[PDB]
Structure 1
């Protein structure tokens, strides 16, 4: 209406408004202390309240962009602290708003956020919950200036619920620590996924994004007509292009408009939206993004008629190649919620290659009549990989599955540093836990969602400090080919075994005292180094050295003496292992 700030305060409600304002300033003024942000917030909040009381009071008709910038240019130390950013204050809107956007700092050189002790946290939570919660909201927002503000707020609400539940339990730490591990891991994943999609959009362009979305949205909304999916993809692409440009309010507005459009047209989109569409503005787009797949239409034909049989395949294709290809994707994806989106794209791309050849030929129908046979192998390759890995997981359990992976990936790419091997194998292991639990029909999507980030973090680590041609080869492939390429890496037979180091395989009795998580990391570090030193060792030779170690550890950790048993028996295990391998 007349006052943007007032309209945002009425839609969001006071609590949400204050938190979002905190996150928004935090992400720009990343070196200002917490107490200075409490001050901005209270100042922006009292102003907003005067506009609620009276839409036409002084300054209430300014744009939110204008007010945000004005507030930013009001910080006294802005030049001293942020430098270039203060020169934005000399510009007029809209140039000013675009100048602020260029001058966020992505790596503010801030010490990492240490998780205090449980009783320290729960005491702070009891004494000043709002301070505890917003001080940490500030610390996270300042460290992740591109984390979509409303999503960060959603996380904060889950942290609050976990403190609320767990700080009253019998065993506080056993309740809370798993929840914070889970929240940290989801927050880190959500953050890398937001960054990867914007990098993808720029790298692979808008067509590939649109392909990706058609497939994802047809799986979610299989009852929708194609033209509806297509409308939603066009808008989704807009949203995501604006969101990647980094202006939070424009992003939020475009997301809200789309959410509104979907809710006003549920009957044309999906039967699963009722609940999301009843929620308030703030939660609506987020709830829509998480909704489960609608049940597909009861009795659907095979895609044979429209895409192989029908005489107007080549004619329908040449007329609008991407509409046609998109229709194929839609039809394939709606009947296959059980595939990864990239599988579906491999498929679509196979059908594209095939129409480009076959529509150029004398009898098109006969050239391409067997195109669906070429999909069988593509579909089976990830299905088999899921079978093999989830069966191997069941008989081994998370920890020893990771170890199976260590051995396997270290023999594949032994040039990779031991810490990157450990972390990536530990992580792949967790993707095996999370996703081999799901029923068959959600396994491949799950694994996709999670491998995409585990693999992109492996690549970014590695392209910022490189070691293996192959790894680079797979990381600079198409994003459809990324995972298959990694899967095809073979044991490196041109690797020169790493020279023995005494210390690497020396263990002191502190390891009997380390936490579960840390003792595994120490063991897994040694396993990697063991495989680096003797790459030729077989699975049974390695199991003999590993089961020898398993009996070395526990038969010096319950003993009348400790660090002697580790010094003296640890000479015996090492020389016996060197001889055996």
Structure 2
């Protein structure tokens, strides 16, 4: 339409619009109180209704960026992003998006406290959810956040009328919260690939993953879906959230109305309501690959004639054909195979006798031996021992990395052994390798915020695919001569916290111990980690309390 806001408002409805806009505000200005934005959002919503009645009305033709930026610049904690033209302002807000914004961790009130607030003002409760999530996750998938919001509303609507509200609601919120971090982590990688590597980098990745999942589809179908997807995530990762959710609603539409040309596993995904549609398709299982499929063609003579007539379309089709056949090959491995074949086709183009042994070119043996060998060690140590085993070997590599970043990163890295070492041989690499680069991007984004090491940054700026191999061969930091002591930190209130929170601290000290004593042997190191745990347990099981 002529007016932009009215088009989105109509398509999405007032409910989603209101939610989508609020999420937009919370992700730009992450510091502003809950109440102050709510005021801004409703003003935009109320104004949105003006343009719906009549698009000709003043200020309606304005772009979504302009309208949003104007109402935000109305609220020493001043970066001063209110800097003239919209190409500058919006990109400014995008620039300032704090991955780790430093906000108090919200504590979870008692079940009875939360249920009553749900009966008082149910609207306010759900808004505070979108608010607090969008603040601490500025690169969260907005339309995926709307889905989680509804599920949040379902848990309270169901449990708070139960006999035992605490046994119902708590298992779920913990479940929702785990999925929250996962949905956030995964979506940050999609924004990193785009904004730090390029649209072609995102297209390539998308082609590969889709191909494995919709192998029954023709090439241009997947090619279509890649274009449509890239446009959704680009909109989302750039603040244009309204266009993001709107397109994604349209994306699922065109998909469910063309299932037979795409996949068979969308059967009941398209049974679920509007939001539940998008979520299902995103996670949908890989469709069975068609039987009686060729391999190659045994190299063709017209290889360089077709590679020059449509390079990307060829390489894309290569990627399509190869990925659709190998559900067991990780996207990272596949992109390596696609990049090894492209450079072979660049130098060689007697071409035939040059690119004959390309498919003979080891890239596959590396991840295989990686997963098999490590899951062995993970079975030997266990999650908390493997985490601990990694916390040392990684602080060793880069002691300069802040302890918090070392902990969470190393924590989440070990958790690979719990997630993917369960699957058969075939479902490991699509699980592990993919999940690894997600956690690896966590480090990169945290590090990029407060950088203190070149080795870490070297891998992050390098090829996204080569991140893992690069990080595994950073050697051990020798020039870490200064290893200053820490008096106050070791001094352990720690007994009112959950068992999980307790271990996290015990792991915080593990890093600090190596940061003070790098060359300290793991044999004398292991002794300290056992006693320090034996001390905390002993001095709280006793009537010492806060004296020991």
Give TM class, smaller chain.
0.7 to 0.9
CA contact (8 A) 1:263 1:277 kept: yes
Q: Offset at 1:421?
A: 1.7
Q: Helix, strand or coil: the match of 1:436? A: coil
RMSD: 4.7
Q: Offset at 1:205?
A: 2.1
CA contact (8 A) 2:539 2:545 kept: yes
Deviations for 1:368-402, whole angstroms, at most 9, x for unmatched residues?
3332332xx21122222222332322333322221
Deviations for 1:157-179, whole angstroms, at most 9, x for unmatched residues?
12223334555677766665554
CA contact (8 A) 1:497 1:535 kept: no
Pick closer, same or farther for the CA change 1:145–1:211 going to 2, 3 Å: closer
Cα separation, 1, equivalents of 2:299 and 2:513? 58
- Residue in 2 that maps onto 1:24: 24
Cα separation, 2, equivalents of 1:550 and 1:241? 47
Pick closer, same or farther for the CA change 1:538–1:184 going to 2, 3 Å: same
Pick closer, same or farther for the CA change 1:536–1:373 going to 2, 3 Å: farther
CA contact (8 A) 1:18 1:45 kept: yes
Pick closer, same or farther for the CA change 1:235–1:179 going to 2, 3 Å: same
Q: Offset at 1:251?
A: 2.8
Pick closer, same or farther for the CA change 1:281–1:92 going to 2, 3 Å: farther
Identify the match of residue 532 of structure 1 among 515, 523, 532. Answer: 515
Cα separation, 1, equivalents of 2:520 and 2:439? 28
Pick closer, same or farther for the CA change 1:11–1:465 going to 2, 3 Å: closer
CA contact (8 A) 2:65 2:90 kept: yes
Cα separation, 2, equivalents of 1:235 and 1:211? 14
CA contact (8 A) 2:99 2:446 kept: no
CA contact (8 A) 1:11 1:281 kept: no
Q: Offset at 1:355?
A: 2.1
Cα separation, 1, equivalents of 2:532 and 2:86? 67
Q: Helix, strand or coil: the match of 1:89? A: coil
Deviations for 1:307-336, whole angstroms, at most 9, x for unmatched residues?
x53333333323322222222211211111
Q: Offset at 1:300?
A: 2.7
Single out whichever of 266-275 and 180-189 deviates more from structure 2: 180-189
CA contact (8 A) 1:266 1:273 kept: yes
The answer to which structure, 1 or 2, has the higher relative contact order (CA under 8 A, 6+ apart) is: 2
Q: Structure 2 regions of 5+ residues with no counterpart?
A: none
Pick closer, same or farther for the CA change 1:182–1:427 going to 2, 3 Å: farther
Cα separation, 2, equivalents of 1:39 and 1:555? 52
Pick closer, same or farther for the CA change 1:109–1:470 going to 2, 3 Å: closer
Q: Offset at 1:245?
A: 4.1
Pick closer, same or farther for the CA change 1:108–1:401 going to 2, 3 Å: closer
- Residue in 1 that maps onto 2:357: 370
Pick closer, same or farther for the CA change 1:433–1:357 going to 2, 3 Å: same
Cα separation, 2, equivalents of 1:435 and 1:319? 42
Q: Offset at 1:349?
A: 0.7
- Residue in 1 that maps onto 2:432: 447
Q: Offset at 1:67?
A: 9.1
Q: Offset at 1:530?
A: 3.2
Q: Offset at 1:350?
A: 1.0
CA contact (8 A) 2:328 2:430 kept: yes
Q: Offset at 1:105?
A: 9.8
Q: Offset at 1:222?
A: 0.6
Pick closer, same or farther for the CA change 1:135–1:246 going to 2, 3 Å: closer
Q: Give the TM-score of the pair, scaled to structure 1.
A: 0.76
Pick closer, same or farther for the CA change 1:128–1:254 going to 2, 3 Å: closer
Pick closer, same or farther for the CA change 1:412–1:258 going to 2, 3 Å: same
Cα separation, 2, equivalents of 1:89 and 1:525? 39
Q: Structure 1 regions of 5+ residues with no counterpart?
A: 76-82, 566-581
CA contact (8 A) 2:11 2:246 kept: no
CA contact (8 A) 2:99 2:445 kept: no
Deviations for 1:89-116, whole angstroms, at most 9, x for unmatched residues?
9999999999999999999896664443
Q: Tell whether 2:504 aligns with 1:521.
A: yes
Pick closer, same or farther for the CA change 1:254–1:85 going to 2, 3 Å: farther
Cα separation, 2, equivalents of 1:459 and 1:257? 33
Q: Offset at 1:446?
A: 2.5
Pick closer, same or farther for the CA change 1:319–1:49 going to 2, 3 Å: closer
Q: Offset at 1:470?
A: 1.7
CA contact (8 A) 2:208 2:323 kept: yes
Q: Helix, strand or coil: the match of 1:26? A: helix
Pick closer, same or farther for the CA change 1:330–1:104 going to 2, 3 Å: closer
CA contact (8 A) 2:506 2:529 kept: no
Q: Give the TM-score of the pair, scaled to structure 2.
A: 0.80
CA contact (8 A) 2:328 2:427 kept: yes
Deviations for 1:528-549, whole angstroms, at most 9, x for unmatched residues?
2333444344444544444455
Deviations for 1:508-546, whole angstroms, at most 9, x for unmatched residues?
xx5556431232123212322333444344444544444
- Residue in 2 that maps onto 1:420: 405
Q: Offset at 1:135?
A: 3.4
Cα separation, 1, equivalents of 2:209 and 2:366? 20
CA contact (8 A) 1:505 1:526 kept: yes
CA contact (8 A) 1:219 1:334 kept: yes
Pick closer, same or farther for the CA change 1:499–1:30 going to 2, 3 Å: closer
| Residues 169-568 of structure 1 aligned to structure 2 (within 5 Å) | 176-177=169-170, 179-303=172-296, 309-359=299-349, 363-374=350-361, 377-493=362-478, 495-496=480-481, 498=483, 505=490, 511=494, 514-549=497-532, 551=534, 554=537, 558=541
Single out whichever of 265-274 and 196-205 deviates more from structure 2: 196-205
Cα separation, 2, equivalents of 1:519 and 1:182? 20
Which is higher, the Rg of structure 1 or of structure 2?
1
Q: Offset at 1:443?
A: 2.4
